[PDB]
């Protein structure tokens, strides 16, 4: 009907008008790299990791924000696309702390995984690194903000999901710091969910700190009983012990969020 | 048929006739010089007539990009959806080396006010927001006085100039950010948010300030619009090369005998401009090292190119640089070229918004390297690394500030590489 | 009135003060026009 | 020292007294009326600058008040203050000396200006004088590149300076007089120093050059 026709690496896909390059690539099974885009949050276009080449076009476009146009051929595995990803990852890791062994996000980090798949194998950064202060936003979320990649997912979640506008950016440039400026607690019935969306170890669970690693946990899909919503969850168990509760996506109930009590 | 020589603009063909502040800047004086004249007839002729004349003039934006203005202003010429429509005038004037817009605002304010109306009528706008940098307090106050004078005299307001068109002109002051000169960042600063640019699409003509159709224009671009309409576009096209038509305010700064602001015909030879108005280079043309033609965000050119380069959009592109704001910075052979360029990178470091990764981290990374290049604490193989770092910041950023911090570094590596290597090896001998 | 090009006529700014710019905007309020309305007191409404 | 986090102090705390004066509320009402209904947040910057002009700096209470009157989340006001460099989140002197050190002003020996002020006021860049009259900082291009070297003190530009002149400007400020803004060389603005090379002929009167119909 109103569907338009676009090509992803030459294969035709029919997409509704308003669809993004990103969403089009999904319908052929390709996942564009991402750090800032989240399907349930507002588009930001700041990480620049989604950049993808359009054939017969000289500039790479941010797939997360650019609508598809009829006739576009999206080159997800081109040299220009692959070189853009390597450059962005190089900037992301330049000031990133060498904390993977001491970082609870190890083994389930998108920066680690997307560096391995879409990044280089070595560094050419011969300078010093940035260091940031740590910010206390309550007893449930641990902040090691030197690991932040400034994706603003936490800022958007609090404003657009929790309805709390307490997280923001202070400063500009390399010194831009996510936080509350003042000493404040991000206490809410949905506070813990910023831990999941944060793709790095900047925001982590204090109760779960240091107890386990992702690979050694068995995943059990159960249900939450703290309330009557029946939120679908995953129970991570190691050696006959319960280590953490994670959300399991159910569109018609909890989407991909759970309450702090459940968590 | 053809003009193969350009320059020597006669004062009667100049547009900014009080550029130096030697006449009255209030309404009475400006009306003598020709402002606010038959403006009722311009407005009644219609939006299509105003846009058509601006298209014929070949006018291009003086803010930096140089996009054809008439085509840009015609995006807004469309039926209303219910939302208002606004004209935004960019007086942020943040580009280092550039000071043209300060004079227009403070010595010829009423040209700007009249341009808002004529530009606004063409676009269909209901008002104009003139965004002026916060350090231009005295200049901002002068504009408000002028706007009050026009409001009291019926030139702007309800039924302005007796044309049946309602137009209001507001002035909003920034608080200290070069990045607010970027058209989308400027919009967001007016809306009350951090001066961080937007992604395009959406384009400002569809979604702009307050989520309404908007067009962002430079002070010089707007100020010349009334004059183009009275005297005619062909007059404005009579000057300059084809597709580089018009007259341009130039700012000559640096190691010159008489640094100055001056209006000259587009495509004027660069050597003529410096020698004629500015008094030449300190120590003469043979002491010239390099020139930055269009402000910090433009690659430098060495003396070998400065001899025979015309100051227009196209010619400076073929030299691997850009006209930009037409702000000329001149460095002599006594200059430490690397230290000069490094300080510009240090400026882009302090002005990046931090929104997007390649400039938030890359510009810092380039700054740190260039600082070492100054002391020589680097190996010759880091020069080519800096080039690739620059090319990873170019085309991968939201705005053009990153594009504007890579091109300067690319210019130094392109034309002054031997200077970089010579400093490195000297530091190696000293550390023996 | 005779043409004199040897004086700087923009000398008013030597007297401006801290509150000048905002005072003039206050005096300019009466001359404006009715602003347009989105339809809600704020985006948070 | 370039900190973008707030730690409560005896002088700066959410209960530190600050409210606009009755005159400044009327000024606010004009500021808020310049923008469409439903977008009062657009007034954050101008209203914030108003608070700093009344008080001299922006304490944490000042930011909160701006948010309360505009019904804006307090954090969003904190973001604006930190992003923009004209907002003083620490107390500054009665006179705020700003020196442009960018390349065009650096090529014309703006460093000499910076060294002269340091010697006379007995302070290093970024520090405040013991008497709290003067505060020195380096800044970027201030829009007066042809008139370099230049400094801004409060809201006035003093241009085409020389090490002697900037000491004079300080001396006048110390005594009580407020010096005269503008180039301190034998010229008035951006005009070619030695003499005008353009706009020497009388300006052309109205109706000159008008096209056929118009
Ligand atoms: C970092 C940055 C700073 C800019 N500063 C200015 C400025 O101070 N004045 C200006 O007119 N344009 C500036 N621009 C260009 C604007 O983004 C925009 O292209 C221009 O204002 C459009 O006006 P025009 O069509 O009349 O040229 C800047 C752009 C960037 C990326
Ligand atoms: S966030 Fe990821 S890349 Fe960074 S230290 Fe933690 S595990 Fe390593
Ligand atoms: S703390 Fe995490 S979610 Fe928030 S901006 Fe930083 S990386 Fe993104
Ligand atoms: S390139 Fe720099 S200034 Fe432009 S949006 Fe990205 S971080 Fe901000
Ligand atoms: S996923 Fe598109 S810029 Fe981050
Ligand atoms: S470089 Fe100093 S005012 Fe522009
Ligand atoms: K996390």
UniProtKB/Swiss-Prot annotation, chain A:
<feature type="modified residue" description="N6-acetyllysine">
    <location>
        <position position="56"/>
    </location>
</feature>
<feature type="binding site">
    <location>
        <position position="50"/>
    </location>
    <ligand>
        <name>[2Fe-2S] cluster</name>
    </ligand>
</feature>
<feature type="domain" description="4Fe-4S His(Cys)3-ligated-type">
    <location>
        <begin position="80"/>
        <end position="119"/>
    </location>
</feature>
<feature type="binding site">
    <location>
        <position position="100"/>
    </location>
    <ligand>
        <name>[4Fe-4S] cluster 1</name>
    </ligand>
</feature>
<comment type="function">
    <text>Core subunit of the mitochondrial membrane respiratory chain NADH dehydrogenase (Complex I) which catalyzes electron transfer from NADH through the respiratory chain, using ubiquinone as an electron acceptor. Essential for catalysing the entry and efficient transfer of electrons within complex I. Plays a key role in the assembly and stability of complex I and participates in the association of complex I with ubiquinol-cytochrome reductase complex (Complex III) to form supercomplexes.</text>
</comment>
<feature type="domain" description="2Fe-2S ferredoxin-type">
    <location>
        <begin position="2"/>
        <end position="80"/>
    </location>
</feature>
<protein>
    <recommendedName>
        <fullName>NADH-ubiquinone oxidoreductase 75 kDa subunit, mitochondrial</fullName>
    </recommendedName>
</protein>
<feature type="binding site">
    <location>
        <position position="151"/>
    </location>
    <ligand>
        <name>[4Fe-4S] cluster 2</name>
    </ligand>
</feature>
<feature type="binding site">
    <location>
        <position position="154"/>
    </location>
    <ligand>
        <name>[4Fe-4S] cluster 2</name>
    </ligand>
</feature>
<feature type="binding site">
    <location>
        <position position="47"/>
    </location>
    <ligand>
        <name>[2Fe-2S] cluster</name>
    </ligand>
</feature>
<feature type="domain" description="4Fe-4S Mo/W bis-MGD-type">
    <location>
        <begin position="217"/>
        <end position="263"/>
    </location>
</feature>
<feature type="binding site">
    <location>
        <position position="148"/>
    </location>
    <ligand>
        <name>[4Fe-4S] cluster 2</name>
    </ligand>
</feature>
Curated annotation (Swiss-Prot), chain B:
<keyword id="KW-0411">Iron-sulfur</keyword>
<dbReference type="InterPro" id="IPR037207">
    <property type="entry name" value="Nuop51_4Fe4S-bd_sf"/>
</dbReference>
<dbReference type="InterPro" id="IPR019575">
    <property type="entry name" value="Nuop51_4Fe4S-bd"/>
</dbReference>
<keyword id="KW-0488">Methylation</keyword>
<comment type="subunit">
    <text>Core subunit of respiratory chain NADH dehydrogenase (Complex I) which is composed of 45 different subunits. This is a component of the flavoprotein-sulfur (FP) fragment of the enzyme. Interacts with RAB5IF.</text>
</comment>
<dbReference type="InterPro" id="IPR011538">
    <property type="entry name" value="Nuo51_FMN-bd"/>
</dbReference>
<feature type="binding site">
    <location>
        <begin position="61"/>
        <end position="70"/>
    </location>
    <ligand>
        <name>NADH</name>
    </ligand>
</feature>
<keyword id="KW-0999">Mitochondrion inner membrane</keyword>
<dbReference type="InterPro" id="IPR050837">
    <property type="entry name" value="ComplexI_51kDa_subunit"/>
</dbReference>
<dbReference type="InterPro" id="IPR037225">
    <property type="entry name" value="Nuo51_FMN-bd_sf"/>
</dbReference>
<feature type="binding site">
    <location>
        <position position="399"/>
    </location>
    <ligand>
        <name>[4Fe-4S] cluster</name>
    </ligand>
</feature>
<dbReference type="GO" id="GO:0051287">
    <property type="term" value="F:NAD binding"/>
</dbReference>
From Swiss-Prot, chain C:
<protein>
    <recommendedName>
        <fullName>NADH dehydrogenase [ubiquinone] flavoprotein 3, mitochondrial</fullName>
    </recommendedName>
</protein>
<feature type="modified residue" description="Phosphoserine">
    <location>
        <position position="42"/>
    </location>
</feature>
<comment type="function">
    <text>Accessory subunit of the mitochondrial membrane respiratory chain NADH dehydrogenase (Complex I), that is believed not to be involved in catalysis. Complex I functions in the transfer of electrons from NADH to the respiratory chain. The immediate electron acceptor for the enzyme is believed to be ubiquinone. May be the terminally assembled subunit of Complex I.</text>
</comment>
<comment type="similarity">
    <text>Belongs to the complex I NDUFV3 subunit family.</text>
</comment>
<comment type="subunit">
    <text>Complex I is composed of 45 different subunits. This is a component of the flavoprotein-sulfur (FP) fragment of the enzyme.</text>
</comment>
UniProtKB/Swiss-Prot annotation, chain D:
<feature type="binding site">
    <location>
        <position position="141"/>
    </location>
    <ligand>
        <name>[2Fe-2S] cluster</name>
    </ligand>
</feature>
<dbReference type="InterPro" id="IPR041921">
    <property type="entry name" value="NuoE_N"/>
</dbReference>
<dbReference type="GO" id="GO:0045271">
    <property type="term" value="C:respiratory chain complex I"/>
</dbReference>
<dbReference type="Pfam" id="PF01257">
    <property type="entry name" value="2Fe-2S_thioredx"/>
</dbReference>
<keyword id="KW-0560">Oxidoreductase</keyword>
<keyword id="KW-0007">Acetylation</keyword>
<comment type="similarity">
    <text>Belongs to the complex I 24 kDa subunit family.</text>
</comment>
<keyword id="KW-0830">Ubiquinone</keyword>
<feature type="modified residue" description="N6-acetyllysine">
    <location>
        <position position="26"/>
    </location>
</feature>
<comment type="subunit">
    <text>Core subunit of respiratory chain NADH dehydrogenase (Complex I) which is composed of 45 different subunits. This is a component of the flavoprotein-sulfur (FP) fragment of the enzyme.</text>
</comment>
<comment type="function">
    <text>Core subunit of the mitochondrial membrane respiratory chain NADH dehydrogenase (Complex I) which catalyzes electron transfer from NADH through the respiratory chain, using ubiquinone as an electron acceptor. Parts of the peripheral arm of the enzyme, where the electrons from NADH are accepted by flavin mononucleotide (FMN) and then passed along a chain of iron-sulfur clusters by electron tunnelling to the final acceptor ubiquinone. Contains one iron-sulfur cluster.</text>
</comment>
<keyword id="KW-0472">Membrane</keyword>
């Amino acid at each position: 009907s109103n569907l338009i026709e676009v090509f992803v690496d030459g294969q035709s896909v029919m997409v509704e008008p308003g669809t993004t390059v990103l969403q089009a690539c999904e319908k052929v099974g390709m996942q564009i790299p991402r750090f800032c885009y989240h399907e349930r949050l507002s588009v930001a276009g700041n990480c620049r990791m989604c950049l993808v080449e359009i054939e017969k076009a000289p500039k790479v476009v941010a797939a997360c924000a650019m609508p598809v146009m009829k006739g576009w051929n999206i080159l997800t595995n081109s040299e220009k696309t692959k070189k853009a990803r390597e450059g962005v990852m190089e900037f992301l890791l330049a000031n990133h702390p060498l904390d993977c062994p001491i970082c609870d996000q190890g083994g389930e980090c998108d920066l680690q995984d997307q560096s391995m798949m879409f990044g280089s194998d070595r560094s050419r950064f011969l300078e010093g690194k940035r260091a940031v202060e740590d910010k206390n936003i309550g007893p449930l979320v641990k902040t090691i903000m030197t690991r932040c990649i400034q994706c603003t997912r936490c800022i958007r979640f609090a404003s657009e999901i929790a309805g709390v506008d307490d997280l923001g950016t202070t400063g500009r440039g390399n010194d831009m710091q996510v936080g509350t400026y003042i000493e404040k607690m991000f206490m809410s019935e949905l506070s813990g969910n910023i831990i999941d969306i944060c793709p790095v170890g900047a925001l982590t669970s204090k109760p779960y700190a240091f107890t386990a690693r992702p690979w050694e946990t068995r995943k059990t899909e159960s249900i939450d009983v703290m309330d009557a919503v029946g939120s679908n969850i995953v129970v991570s168990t190691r050696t006959g012990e319960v280590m953490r509760i994670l959300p399991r996506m159910h569109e018609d109930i909890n989407e991909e969020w759970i309450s702090d009590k459940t968590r | 048929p053809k003009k193969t020589s350009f320059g020597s603009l006669k004062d009667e063909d100049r547009i900014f006739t009080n550029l130096y502040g030697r006449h009255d800047w209030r309404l009475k004086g400006a009306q003598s010089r020709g402002d606010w004249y038959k403006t009722k007839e311009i407005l009644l002729k219609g939006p299509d007539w105003i846009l058509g004349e601006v298209k014929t003039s070949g006018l291009r934006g003086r803010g930096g990009a140089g996009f054809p203005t008439g085509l840009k202003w015609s995006f807004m010429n469309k039926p209303s959806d219910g939302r208002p429509k606004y004209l935004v005038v960019n007086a942020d004037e943040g580009e280092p080396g550039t000071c043209k817009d300060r004079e227009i605002i403070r010595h010829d304010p009423h040209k700007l006010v009249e341009g808002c109306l004529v530009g606004g009528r063409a676009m269909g706008a209901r008002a104009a927001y003139i965004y002026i940098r916060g350090e231009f307090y005295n200049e901002a106050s002068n504009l408000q006085v002028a706007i009050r004078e026009a409001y009291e005299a019926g030139l702007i307001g309800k039924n302005a100039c007796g044309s049946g068109y309602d137009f209001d002109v507001f002035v909003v002051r920034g608080a200290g950010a070069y990045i607010c000169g970027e058209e989308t960042a400027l919009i967001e600063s007016i809306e009350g948010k951090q001066g961080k640019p937007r992604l395009k699409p959406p384009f400002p003509a569809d979604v702009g300030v307050f989520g309404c159709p908007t067009t962002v224009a430079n002070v010089e671009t707007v100020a010349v619009s009334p004059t183009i309409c009275r005297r005619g576009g062909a007059w404005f096209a009579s000057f300059g090369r084809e597709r580089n038509s018009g007259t341009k305010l130039f700012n000559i700064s640096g190691h010159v005998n008489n640094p100055c602001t001056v209006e000259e015909e587009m495509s004027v030879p660069l050597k003529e401009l410096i020698e004629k108005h500015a008094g030449g280079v300190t120590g003469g043309w043979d002491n010239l090292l390099a020139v930055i033609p269009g402000g910090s965000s433009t690659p430098l050119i060495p003396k070998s190119v400065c001899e025979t380069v015309l100051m227009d959009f196209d010619a400076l592109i073929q030299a691997q640089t850009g006209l930009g704001t037409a702000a000329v910075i001149v460095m002599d052979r006594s200059t430490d070229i690397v230290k000069a360029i490094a300080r510009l990178i240090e400026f882009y470091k302090h002005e990046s918004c931090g929104q997007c990764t390649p400039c938030r981290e890359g510009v810092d990374w380039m700054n740190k390297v260039m600082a070492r290049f100054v002391r020589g604490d680097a190996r010759p193989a880091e020069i080519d690394s800096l080039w690739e770092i620059s090319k990873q910041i170019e085309g991968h950023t939201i705005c053009a500030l990153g594009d504007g911090a890579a091109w300067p570094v690319q210019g130094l590596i392109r034309h002054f590489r031997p200077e970089l290597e010579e400093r490195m090896q000297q530091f190696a001998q000293q550390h023996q | 009135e005779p043409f004199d090009n040897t004086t700087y006529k923009n000398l008013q700014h030597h007297d401006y003060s801290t509150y000048t710019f905002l005072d003039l905007n206050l005096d300019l309020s009466k001359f404006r026009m009715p602003q347009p309305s989105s339809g809600r007191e704020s985006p948070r409404h | 020292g370039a900190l973008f986090v707030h730690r409560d102090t005896p002088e700066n705390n959410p209960e530190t007294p600050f409210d606009f004066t009755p005159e400044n509320y009327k000024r606010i009402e004009a500021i808020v009326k310049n923008y469409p209904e439903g977008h009062k947040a657009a007034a954050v910057l101008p209203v914030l600058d108003l608070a700093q002009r009344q008080n001299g700096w922006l304490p944490i209470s000042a930011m909160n008040k701006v948010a309360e009157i505009l019904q804006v989340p307090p954090m969003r006001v904190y973001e604006v203050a930190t992003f923009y460099t004209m907002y003083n989140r620490k107390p500054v002197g009665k006179y705020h000396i700003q020196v442009c050190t960018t390349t065009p002003c650096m090529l014309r020996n703006s460093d000499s200006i910076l060294e002269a002020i340091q010697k006379k006021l007995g302070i290093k860049v970024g520090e405040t004088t013991p008497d709290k009259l003067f505060t020195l900082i380096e800044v970027e291009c201030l829009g007066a590149c042809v008139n370099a070297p230049m400094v801004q003190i409060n809201d006035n530009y003093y241009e085409d300076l020389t090490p002697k002149d900037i000491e004079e400007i300080i001396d006048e400020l110390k005594a009580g007089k407020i010096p005269k803004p503008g180039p301190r060389s034998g010229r008035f603005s951006c005009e070619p120093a030695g003499g005008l090379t353009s706009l020497t002929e009388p300006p052309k009167g109205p109706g000159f050059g008008v096209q056929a119909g118009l």
